[PDB]
Ligand binder design. Structure first.
Ligand SMILES: Nc1nc(=O)c2nc(CNc3ccc(C(=O)N[C@@H](CCC(=O)O)C(=O)O)cc3)cnc2[nH]1
Length: 186
């Protein structure tokens, strides 16, 4: 298994969801970015592993629930078995990461992308080692009920550029957004 990454789309107030959905209107090209990022793979395996919380899983339309082309792993303590459409289940992140190097996944997996739950984000960011945060900055206030943990700029450095990532401001449906990538080694 390669790299450990987190991806998120945050609004001005640092909101990531509103009643189990996006605080803002659907932004196509942004969804496109989410998709390509988490899907494209290479060295160390062949396919990416997407780790998400229970609520995150259910937050995705049933239509494309099992994110096509990625190994889907749900994190929960309540669940006894992975929800319909899901591939693997884990009790926690440290449990989920350990899984990634045992026979079952070790060869198969490249990158691991954390995509959901404020609690998952929070813990991942705390995870010791090399990590990158792929953040989409939605440049407006949106009514939220769930938020993204504060990023400690004392350890996370915002990179000047990243290959494949547009560094200028985007706009869709009258909403302007920016792509940012932060890296850390702890
Ligand atoms: N940058 C970013 N943007 C998001 O919208 C995002 N959303 C979440 C959590 N919620 C969801 C909800 C639905 C889908 C989804 O239905 N994804 C399709 C997108 C394809 C397209 O619409 O063009 C996918 O297959 O990945 C993904 C994430 C986590 N990180 C994100 N990170």
């Amino acid at each position: 298994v390669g790299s450990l990454n987190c991806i998120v789309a945050v609004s001005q107030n640092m909101g990531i969801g509103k009643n189990g959905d996006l605080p803002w209107p659907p932004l196509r090209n942004e969804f496109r970015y989410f998709q390509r990022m988490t899907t494209t793979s290479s060295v160390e395996g062949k396919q990416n592993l997407v780790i998400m919380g229970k609520k995150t899983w259910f937050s995705i339309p049933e239509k494309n629930r099992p994110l096509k082309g990625r190994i889907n792993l749900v994190l929960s303590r309540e669940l006894k078995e992975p929800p319909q459409g899901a591939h693997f289940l884990s009790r926690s992140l440290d449990d989920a990461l350990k899984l990634t190097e045992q026979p079952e996944l070790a060869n198969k997996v490249d990158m691991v992308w954390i995509v959901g739950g404020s609690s998952v984000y929070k813990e991942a960011m705390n995870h010791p080692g090399h990590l990158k945060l792929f953040v989409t900055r939605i440049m407006q206030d949106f009514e939220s009920d769930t938020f993204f943990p504060e990023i400690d700029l004392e350890k996370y450095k915002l990179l000047p550029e990243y290959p494949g990532v547009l560094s200028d401001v985007q706009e869709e449906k009258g909403i302007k957004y920016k792509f940012e990538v932060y890296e850390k080694n702890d």
